[PDB]
Give the backbone structure.
Amino acid sequence: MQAIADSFSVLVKELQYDNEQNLESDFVTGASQFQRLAPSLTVPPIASPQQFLRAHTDDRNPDCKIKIAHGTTTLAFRFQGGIIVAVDSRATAGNWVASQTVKKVIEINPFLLGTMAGGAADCQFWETWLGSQCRLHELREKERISVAAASKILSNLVYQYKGAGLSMGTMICGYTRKEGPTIYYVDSDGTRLKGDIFCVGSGQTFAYGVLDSNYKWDLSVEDALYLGKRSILAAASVNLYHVTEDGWIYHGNH
Amino acid sequence: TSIGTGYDLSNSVFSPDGRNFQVEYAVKAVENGTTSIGIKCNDGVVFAVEKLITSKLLVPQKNVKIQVVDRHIGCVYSGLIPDGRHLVNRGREEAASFKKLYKTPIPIPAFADRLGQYVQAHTLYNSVRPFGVSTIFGGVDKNGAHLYMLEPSGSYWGYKGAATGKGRQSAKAELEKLVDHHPEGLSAREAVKQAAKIIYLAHEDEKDFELEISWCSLSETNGLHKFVKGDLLQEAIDFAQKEIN
Amino acid sequence: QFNPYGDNGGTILGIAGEDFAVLAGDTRNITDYSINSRYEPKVFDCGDNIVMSANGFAADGDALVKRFKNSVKWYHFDHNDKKLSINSAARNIQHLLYGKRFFPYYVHTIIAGLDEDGKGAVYSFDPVGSYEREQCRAGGAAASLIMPFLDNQVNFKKPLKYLSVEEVIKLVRDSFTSATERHIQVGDGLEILIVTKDGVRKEFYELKRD
Amino acid sequence: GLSFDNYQRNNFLAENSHTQPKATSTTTIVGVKFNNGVVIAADTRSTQGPIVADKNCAKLHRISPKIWCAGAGTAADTEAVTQLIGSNIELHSLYTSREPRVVSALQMLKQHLFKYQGHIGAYLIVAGVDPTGSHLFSIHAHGSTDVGYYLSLGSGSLAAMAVLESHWKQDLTKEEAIKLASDAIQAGIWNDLGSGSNVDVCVMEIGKDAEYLRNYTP
Amino acid sequence: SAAGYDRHITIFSPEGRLYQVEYAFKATNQTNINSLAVRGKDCTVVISQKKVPDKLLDPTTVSYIFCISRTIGMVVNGPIPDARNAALRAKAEAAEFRYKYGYDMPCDVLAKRMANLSQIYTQRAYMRPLGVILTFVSVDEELGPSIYKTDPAGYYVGYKATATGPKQQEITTNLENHFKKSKIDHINEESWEKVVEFAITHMIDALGTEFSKNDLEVGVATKDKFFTLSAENIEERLVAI
Amino acid sequence: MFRNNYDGDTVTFSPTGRLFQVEYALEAIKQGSVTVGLRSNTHAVLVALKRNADELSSYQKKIIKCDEHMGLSLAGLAPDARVLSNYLRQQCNYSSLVFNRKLAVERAGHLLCDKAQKNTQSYGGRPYGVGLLIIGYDKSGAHLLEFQPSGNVTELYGTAIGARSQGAKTYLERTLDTFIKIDGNPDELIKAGVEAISQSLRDESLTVDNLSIAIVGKDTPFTIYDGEAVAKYI
Amino acid sequence: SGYDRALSIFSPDGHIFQVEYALEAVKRGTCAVGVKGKNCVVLGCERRSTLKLQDTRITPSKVSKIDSHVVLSFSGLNADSRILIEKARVEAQSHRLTLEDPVTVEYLTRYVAGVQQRYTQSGGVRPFGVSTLIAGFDPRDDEPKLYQTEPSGIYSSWSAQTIGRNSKTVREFLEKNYDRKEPPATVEECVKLTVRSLLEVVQTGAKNIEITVVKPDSDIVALSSEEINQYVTQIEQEKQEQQEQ
Amino acid sequence: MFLTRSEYDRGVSTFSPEGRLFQVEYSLEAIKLGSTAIGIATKEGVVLGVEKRATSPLLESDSIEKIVEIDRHIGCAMSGLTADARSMIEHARTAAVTHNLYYDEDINVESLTQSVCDLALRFGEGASGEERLMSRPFGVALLIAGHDADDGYQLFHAEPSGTFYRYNAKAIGSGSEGAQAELLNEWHSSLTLKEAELLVLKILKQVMEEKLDENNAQLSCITKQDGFKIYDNEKTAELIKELKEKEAAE
Amino acid sequence: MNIVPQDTFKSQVSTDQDKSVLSSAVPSLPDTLRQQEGGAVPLSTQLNDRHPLESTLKNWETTQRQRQMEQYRQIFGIAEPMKRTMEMEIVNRTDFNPLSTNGSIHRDILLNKECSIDWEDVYPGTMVGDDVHSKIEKQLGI
């Protein structure tokens, strides 16, 4: 009854601070905005938010435009005892100087990797979120999360926002004891595929042909690394990742 | 029988005689509070409060017993301090809302009605508690001077002179004598002196006390509510002391 | 249809040294072919030796800076007045930017400070949240007139590591003077904030518009 | 209440390959007030587009035994709104144990039509008698009402209004009012392609039962 | 006295009674004042007894008669806080009826509405009845002068004439005898002043010991307006017998 | 015996007209240690005697910083003190964010009174059981307030709350004009406060572990001294 | 004493009596035993003697398959077991839909325990008076899993556990006859041990015993009356031979 | 002057005449019914040790989990009701993971302890003003052992009352009095990791009615370079044998 | 003082906005199986292509009730809206009928709709859920 009396007792309405979400997002009552496991995304309070976003995202400061991951060639294959993930380190011109190579591959965990092949911010944000979810699952179940479970979580998440404006295509590669080495492709349209060989980017038909020429299950680590490097070069500075049951190992060019 | 067993452990309950015992217990709690009086003169109101002496550590100008709701409304209460503060806040909100909506100071009868409705709304459900305060308020509006007293039951009445607290009976007797001695009218300053005299008489029980007086009159305060300066307060205190002995 | 966005011009530049960082910006707020203000700072000291600047839509930048400052205040309240690192601040700004993914801020953000080891650090943020650490970054409608000047007069491979704070200030001033000569929007002032282990120092220079 | 489901599906079907079936769009309606009552008349011919569907259509709706109305626009909307208001009026009359008033039905219809912001296409002429007298009102589909002595509505409303302006006066009898309404409906029938056949008439007088006449012209 | 429960809420006793409703009914006579309502030829008159034991109390602020609307007046028997609560609710209900149905609220409809609210209070466990008795008087445009009384139990009924208070039996018997003698269910007088004088005389011969202008409160409802008389009007009516 | 039947909750009155649950909440203050507050025309200080569970334990934090110009010290329950401190921090943050205005000490006291009163009249929520001492500096100068959890706030030059706090109150009353006129010398005021709180000790001595100080002033922001920072005042 | 009237009241010694009362309600139910083997899990259940007119085609079984690899038996109130089983099945299907993987035994046990705990967190609700045994194998795993869940929401992992009426005798028998260092190697040994444990309390024998055997790769087999009768006859014959000499 | 019955110890929101909440006291009494947990903080790491009470030999040895990993740099030990401890542990893990997600750094042990205590405060009004979440207070006590760069190695004790303390050595559970006395007698700032482990084992053996071995006691440690790790049966058995040999020799 | 409802659009969205239906394996994601909506209904589709009158009709009596409460507050005071809301809340909270959806008689009396009919009254309108236990959990908050 006291709350009812206070509701009908008289500035805050104009500030819209009588709502919990506004106070939380402006960090008025505490840092609870940075404590949400599932983040809250602002949507325009209009009848056509999707058309509004699409119209305003195609209009002209180069710095104030949504960064898009370049359509560079990305390759992944599982031969006998791991997953080889190969990318090309060909930087793009810009008004900046890089202190290190461009991080075209996202390190989800010491055991999981992902590729951008889409919008940079979307991929980084949602793969960090997926890493947090996998860490929480591993803490709860006292066992490493399966690659299928992580891919399914990411697919469900990107499907819940289907058509809103997200644009991301990732390759989740992981080696578990129960399943072996597995590669999934998760698209922003809710697509979720499982495969042995994946090639994406501006040019991938040539790389896929090179792979099909010299692919077999009875390969070795050095042979697989050489095959990945050769495929990336033929599709054209080749960063390699070898994923085993103990985790992923990075090679600049070897 | 003032103790109704079996019908006094919840708020909204009728006794077999048709009485609410929680409200009567709230009235008994009020009766133990400090003595406060109000006198309605010809063109204004005067409020008087007996203030118990306290530690010297208190800031003299930051602890005033007489509360001001609006520029033309004065209010005092006897009972529980938190309930009195809550009621004063509600009254200030009501007065501000009325002034904003209708662009005129809220008339005293309308303010009294709103306050009484709010107080009475707390005797309808078992999840709340009746206000343990009795409030004497008043002021001046276009119709003249008004003085009202409001009880824990939500019942309010207009009075020529009102008194509440421990020494309510002696104060009421003195008010009746003053009314009898002034059948035609009473001036503001005479009302202030009589209020001081009544407050000093009401303290018959050992403990030193001070007196607070407040005016609200057209001739003196131009319709506003003011406190008492040093000269008038000293004169009233001296008159009360002379009347005592 | 009401258009909620706008543009106020302006140019900002962030450079990372070996033991210091520099963040500078032109202090002119302009609407379309009109000067709103000849001195309106766009670089702010956002707490524990961290400088932040959002360039583009002025209202969005002010809102983002305000939110980040409040978040820093609550961070100090929660954890024993712990000092906020530059990378944690970068991730906080990333989350703040991505929280408006479908109603984005129309700003480009640059922050500068010192890392845990003590070297200068500069982070750059696109409007939706994606960020990275860079040695030098220029934002606004003068970057194409500032970056080639820096690349000509210095090397990032005179190496940038051996530069002192005075030389960096001189290079920034020269580049902004050249941009002011060539570009209409740039001018009327230049404010530089230098972050070192001693704190944040502010300097101002008058450009060719008075 | 009314469902909004399959709205997106219907829009997709309309925009891709399918045509939504049309709804009947109801035709002259007239109301004339005489010294001791009101008369409400309507045409009886209903046509499905350019093809006549029926030569005897009952377009007179009943709200109360002494409060009647005739509607134009979407026939389903008119019928549904009239029936709902009639149920509300009956319940109110039972609750108050009194004869319903025309003003109450007018208020209910106006508020209901203003609730839907004109999405209910019913344009009504409401006549009746009650203890306060005889009343005649016109109600728009957006929730606006008007008061008059003689009213016309429908496709052939202009000819009916011309006839009413020709032969209306303050002091009229029941027979003269019925003849005037019949003449207005006949003019709408002859000079417009939207009206035809017979005329339905309802006469409501003070202190007497409402008289309903079907096919008055024969 | 209730045995177990029924001391707090409104549920059936083993005898099949609601004790809280009966206690609320008993609470209506605490004011120890009486009210009388009579019907004229085209008017209705309500007269209530004023008692001012405290000389400090302002007589002008003591009243139990309320103006619900332009045509309907109300008389409340019982404590004044519940009286004012019921008055405000009746005002709101009448205004809402006028807004919703396009014509003025009749007296009987308002009485039935208040009775339905009382039924809600008597059936719900967490709501208590109001210990007041309401009497609505008006001149309905379809029924002439009208008096309707509602009680805490949820029961309402119309009266040719009525009287409620601690001494209602005497006034009711006197009115019944007068109606039996005159064989009329109302008063055959064309002016409300004569009806007021008749009601004052009836109250005097029922209660006894007479009363002055400061011990009475009179309200008159006509077909146009309901109003409440002042001290001068009551005194002038007292002069005319 | 008769009191036992009318202390069920805060919505019940005794036949004599007493609200026993609020009285019990007020009595709960004595279970905490003693804190002293005192102010002059320029500065306001708080002195707290902290307690530990045992030798291996740490000491309770009895002084909490609410804003760069306002702070408080606790005496009583821990949960209610935490809740009220968080509420005051939220109010100060809201005021600064919306108006760029420092929240006044009197306004904080009024907000606390309004929040605390509502728990003493409704059902389902017990009253608060913590006394607070709030020091601050605003445009009206230095301010010290005593908050009693019944919903009361008093403005005073100096006071003390907690167990055995009557000696400190008597000392502050006696040496009133001495410590009132200490302007521009914060150390003298802090030493006066420590001497005042030393009157409430019983078989205990102030050490660097169980003594905490807080100070606020015209150019001095709200600062807390703990450990070696108070070693000069012992 | 007076501390057993609600789930939210602690006793002075530190007990919640309503939980103990729910356990007492559980203790009246029919016995249910679970035995973990080297490569199989055996769940045995005691059934009341069927009446002459009672149908024997449609009676619900004591052992229910929550999932193709996980089974669940209960003891206590038979009506609440249906609610718990339905919730467990729905959660298993939801987990398979959301993560593409069938639930582990511990995950389902934790979910059931969470539901039971959640039904103890309100004064207007009644906790489930059911104690459950959950058995199975993790997907693509050869490690038997057996868990026990209690009405309060507490679950534990066991190698051989009996719940229900007269469960103390069966528990003592298992403690004196089961050694974790040497679990039974074959399914037949586990079934024989379960039958011999159940025969300590079962008055009749083969017609009051139901047995379900779970083996990896989702092999759940419910034994028929003839097989249990054969086991009972063999056990009785061995017992008679041992008692003769 | 007659002896009646007082009922001020039955509601969580009812004060006693002296201003006490007896439901919190009874929750602590419920805590004292659990097994013993001992924590010792040194300059080389923090050692936690718990007692396993197997009511039946058929119970799984590793089924009992009184030591859990909140995060790689934060471990916890619990005494009391396991159902409430499950919710507390879930909340702590969620808070740590969310802090890592939003700040890209490890959360301070004191921050996590404060978060857990704020959760425990939910039987009344929350710290930020949230309404009540649970009908009764928790019946679990927690020992939280962590390491962070700001304050080194830390050990905290968390109670259902919502207040936490920092301890050099702490003991909770049934045998809390004797264990706490031993810790007070036998703790100094110069203890090493092995000395702390042996002391924990000695005190556990003292306060346990059953003979101490590898199947009824569990040890764990947290260090800077290794995080939080629980010893296996072999290592604990070797430590117990070494302690027995040292005791026999001296 | 509103006649047509305003501010009917969402300002923020998330994957856990529907607190009643959340997954247990991944608490940050919704449970598609227990939603029982069709299995292919993302939340984003609810933010676009809606009938303009749907929001007006869905929240219409609430707007009139709020305007009436505001008028009472302006003319009568805080007490009148406080009492009206208190009575309505008591009536709504006491009732619990898992097998029916029709409102109580006392609610209609308080709402002054004893003899009023709308299309909501005429038209009052699985594998999982829609049982007594789900409604009990929703009502009690467990």
About this structure: Residues 49 and 66 of chain F are 20 Å apart (CA to CA). The helical segments of chain F are 20-27, 78-99, 105-117, 166-174, 176-180, 186-197. The domain at 4-234 of chain F is CATH 3.60.20.10 (Glutamine Phosphoribosylpyrophosphate, subunit 1, domain 1).
